[PDB]
Design an enzyme around this catalytic site. Structure first.
Site, short mmCIF file in Angstrom:
data_model
loop_
_atom_site.label_atom_id
_atom_site.label_comp_id
_atom_site.label_asym_id
_atom_site.label_seq_id
_atom_site.Cartn_x
_atom_site.Cartn_y
_atom_site.Cartn_z
N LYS A 18 -63.96 87.44 9.58
CA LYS A 18 -64.20 87.55 11.02
C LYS A 18 -62.93 87.24 11.82
O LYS A 18 -62.84 87.57 13.00
CB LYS A 18 -65.31 86.58 11.41
CG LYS A 18 -66.70 87.07 10.97
CD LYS A 18 -67.77 86.19 11.56
CE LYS A 18 -69.10 86.40 10.84
NZ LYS A 18 -69.20 85.36 9.76
N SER A 23 -69.45 82.58 14.98
CA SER A 23 -69.36 83.37 13.75
C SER A 23 -70.67 84.08 13.40
O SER A 23 -71.10 84.08 12.25
CB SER A 23 -68.94 82.49 12.56
OG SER A 23 -67.54 82.51 12.36
N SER A 36 -66.52 84.48 5.12
CA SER A 36 -66.54 84.36 6.61
C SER A 36 -65.18 84.51 7.29
O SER A 36 -65.10 84.76 8.50
CB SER A 36 -67.01 82.98 7.06
OG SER A 36 -68.41 82.93 6.79
C1 AIX Z 1 -68.87 82.21 5.65
O1 AIX Z 1 -68.15 82.10 4.66
C2 AIX Z 1 -70.26 81.65 5.75
N1 AIX Z 1 -70.80 81.26 4.45
C3 AIX Z 1 -71.99 81.75 4.05
O2 AIX Z 1 -72.66 82.53 4.72
C4 AIX Z 1 -72.47 81.31 2.69
N2 AIX Z 1 -73.29 82.36 2.12
C5 AIX Z 1 -73.25 80.06 2.78
C6 AIX Z 1 -72.71 78.88 2.26
C7 AIX Z 1 -73.42 77.69 2.34
C8 AIX Z 1 -74.68 77.69 2.93
C9 AIX Z 1 -75.23 78.86 3.43
C10 AIX Z 1 -74.51 80.05 3.36
C11 AIX Z 1 -70.25 80.53 6.79
N3 AIX Z 1 -69.41 79.42 6.36
C12 AIX Z 1 -70.12 78.22 5.94
C13 AIX Z 1 -69.25 76.99 5.87
O3 AIX Z 1 -68.08 77.05 6.32
O4 AIX Z 1 -69.70 75.95 5.33
C14 AIX Z 1 -71.40 78.11 6.77
C15 AIX Z 1 -72.49 77.39 5.99
C16 AIX Z 1 -71.16 77.46 8.13
S1 AIX Z 1 -71.84 79.79 7.09
#
Ligand code: AIX
EC number: 3.4.16.4
Length: 348
Positions: free
Chosen positions: A39, A102, A36
Site C-alpha cells: 500500500k 490501510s 501490507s
Molecule cells: C498487512 O501486512 C496486514 N496483515 C494481514 O492482513 C495479515 N493477514 C494478518 C496478520 C495478523 C493478523 C491478522 C491478519 C496488516 N498488518 C498487520 C500488522 O502489521 O500486524 C495487521 C494485523 C495490522 S493487518
C-alpha cells in the site's frame, strides 16, 4: 567504519534519504511477500494521479461491488473501511483510508477510480516499480493481500519509501497522521513510532509477512537529516518497533549528511570542441550529497576525473563525462557521475 548494530529480525536496511548511503543492512536483497507494505506503492500511484491533476481530492468516487464484504470474498476479514456498493466517498477520504487505516476496500475503490480496474492499476504499480529501480519487486494486488508471485526486499522498500517522500510529498505528508475519522468513528494509525518521544518519525507503513513475522518501513528526521529504515520479519510487534527505533537512533547518533555539491551547482567548467558554445558546466546533479561519520566534514575532499581527454559536442544535460571522487583522509569513500549541466549542440 562505525560498527553496525545487531538487528533482531530477518532482514533490514537503514538508508540516508539525501545521499542514498546504506548505513546498515542485513539480508536486504532477500525476497519476501511485501503484503501490507504494498500500500506504499498504492499510495505512490494515487499521489501521482493527484499531482498530475487527473483526479482531485474533492472528486466523489462510486464504490463498486469489488469493494465490498459480499462481492469480493478476498476482503474477508482484512482491514476495511466497510464501504458498500453505491456509496459515494471522496478521493480524500479513500486516500486517508489507504494511508492511515490501510483499508483494503479503499485501495480497490481508488484503484478502480484511478485506472479503471485493479488489473490496470497493478500495471501502473509495476511500471513505477521498474522506473524506480525496484529490481526485485513485483506487485500482484492493489492492497497487498498475500498473493502468488508478489515479492519485494528491504532494499527496494527503502528505495520506494525514498521515492514516495521525494516525488509525491503531499501524499507522503498524510502518513504521519495519527487518526482520521470516517463515518463518525476515529480510525488510528498503527505506526506506533508516530508517538515516539525519542525520534521524530513521520512514516510510513506497518505489515506482516506470512511465515516471516512483523514489518515496518519508517522514516525519521533530525535536524537537516532524514533516514529511512526497513525491518522485515521481527518476531513480535514490540521488536518490530524497537529494532526500527534502534537503527534510526544509531544513524543519527554517529553519522551526518552533507552536500558538497548542490543540485544545479557547477563543480567544474570544461572546454568543449566543435560546439555551439566553447565551454560547458559539469556537476553532480541530485547525486551530490554524502553521508559520513560525524566530525569528518573537515577531512572530506572532492576531486574529479574525465573519461575522455577532451569533450566534443553534442553534449546533453545529464550526460556522464567522468567521475567525481569523494575522499576521507586520502581515501576514497564515494564516487558519483560527473554530469553535463547544460546542453551544447554541435556547431554549425
Ligand atoms: C498487512 O501486512 C496486514 N496483515 C494481514 O492482513 C495479515 N493477514 C494478518 C496478520 C495478523 C493478523 C491478522 C491478519 C496488516 N498488518 C498487520 C500488522 O502489521 O500486524 C495487521 C494485523 C495490522 S493487518
Amino acid at each position: 567504519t562505525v560498527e553496525a548494530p545487531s538487528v533482531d529480525a530477518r532482514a533490514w536496511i537503514l538508508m540516508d534519504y539525501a545521499s542514498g548511503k546504506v548505513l546498515a543492512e542485513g539480508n536486504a536483497d532477500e525476497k519476501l511477500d511485501p503484503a501490507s507494505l504494498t500500500k506504499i506503492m498504492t499510495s505512490y500511484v494515487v499521489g501521482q494521479a493527484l499531482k498530475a491533476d487527473k483526479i482531485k481530492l474533492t472528486d466523489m468516487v462510486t464504490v463498486g461491488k469489488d469493494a465490498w464484504a459480499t462481492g469480493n470474498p478476498a476482503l474477508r476479514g482484512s482491514s476495511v473501511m466497510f464501504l458498500k456498493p453505491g456509496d459515494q466517498v471522496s478521493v480524500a477520504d479513500l486516500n486517508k483510508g489507504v494511508i492511515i487505516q490501510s483499508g483494503n476496500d479503499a485501495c480497490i475503490a481508488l484503484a478502480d477510480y484511478v485506472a479503471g480496474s485493479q488489473e490496470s492499476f497493478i500495471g501502473l504499480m509495476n511500471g513505477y516499480a521498474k522506473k524506480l529501480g525496484l529490481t526485485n519487486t513485483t506487485f500482484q494486488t492493489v492492497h497487498g493481500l498475500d498473493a502468488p508471485g508478489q515479492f519485494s526486499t528491504a532494499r527496494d522498500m527503502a528505495l520506494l519509501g525514498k521515492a514516495l517522500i521525494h516525488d509525491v510529498p503531499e501524499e507522503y505528508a498524510i502518513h504521519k497522521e495519527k487518526e482520521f475519522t470516517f463515518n463518525k468513528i476515529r480510525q488510528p494509525n498503527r505506526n506506533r513510532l508516530l508517538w515516539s518521544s525519542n525520534l521524530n518519525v513521520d512514516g510510513m507503513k506497518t505489515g506482516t509477512t506470512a511465515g516471516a513475522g512483523y514489518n515496518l518501513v519508517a522514516s525519521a528526521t533530525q535536524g537537516d537529516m532524514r533516514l529511512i529504515s526497513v525491518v522485515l520479519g521481527a518476531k513480535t510487534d514490540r521488536i518490530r518497533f524497537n529494532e526500527s527505533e534502534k537503527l534510526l537512533t544509531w544513524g543519527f547518533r554517529f553519522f551526518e549528511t552533507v552536500t558538497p555539491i548542490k543540485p544545479d551547482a557547477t563543480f567544474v567548467t570544461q572546454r568543449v570542441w566543435f560546439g555551439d558554445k566553447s565551454e560547458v558546466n559539469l556537476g553532480a546533479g541530485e547525486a551530490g550529497s554524502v553521508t559520513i561519520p560525524r566530525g569528518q566534514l573537515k577531512n572530506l575532499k572532492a576531486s574529479y576525473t574525465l573519461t575522455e581527454p577532451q569533450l566534443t559536442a553534442p553534449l546533453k544535460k545529464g550526460q556522464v563525462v567522468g567521475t567525481i571522487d569523494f575522499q576521507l583522509n586520502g581515501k576514497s569513500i564515494e564516487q558519483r557521475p560527473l554530469i553535463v549541466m547544460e546542453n551544447v549542440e554541435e556547431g554549425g
